[PDB]
Amino acid sequence: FSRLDPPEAEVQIDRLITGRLQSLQTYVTQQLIRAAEIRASANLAATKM
Amino acid sequence: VYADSFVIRGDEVRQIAPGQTGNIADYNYKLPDDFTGCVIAWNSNKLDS
Numbered sequence: 001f002s003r004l005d006p007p008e009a010e011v012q013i014d015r016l017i018t019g020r021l022q023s024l025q026t027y028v029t030q031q032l033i034r035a036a037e038i039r040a041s042a043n044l045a046a047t048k049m
Numbered sequence: 050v051y052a053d054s055f056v057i058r059g060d061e062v063r064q065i066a067p068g069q070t071g072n073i074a075d076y077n078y079k080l081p082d083d084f085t086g087c088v089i090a091w092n093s094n095k096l097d098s
Contacts, residue, residue, distance in 0.1 A: 005068050005069065006068030007082075
């Protein structure tokens, strides 16, 4: 926002908004799969106990 | 539609664009960041000078 002229800068920061959004989307997706294999083992512990 | 009209120096004809600072757009006539519409610039050394 300091060096770039304002309309072009908006273009260059579109990389950072969707770059971090892809990083949260990837991180959340791994937790969704990883919570499935824990609930498959939480239901195995609740069955054993 | 909302028109405008003024005469400036030829050095600062590119200073008018949105988001450009200087002295003409800092003291006399500024355009918004979200400016929709455009300008028609042409040399007038024959008439105004």
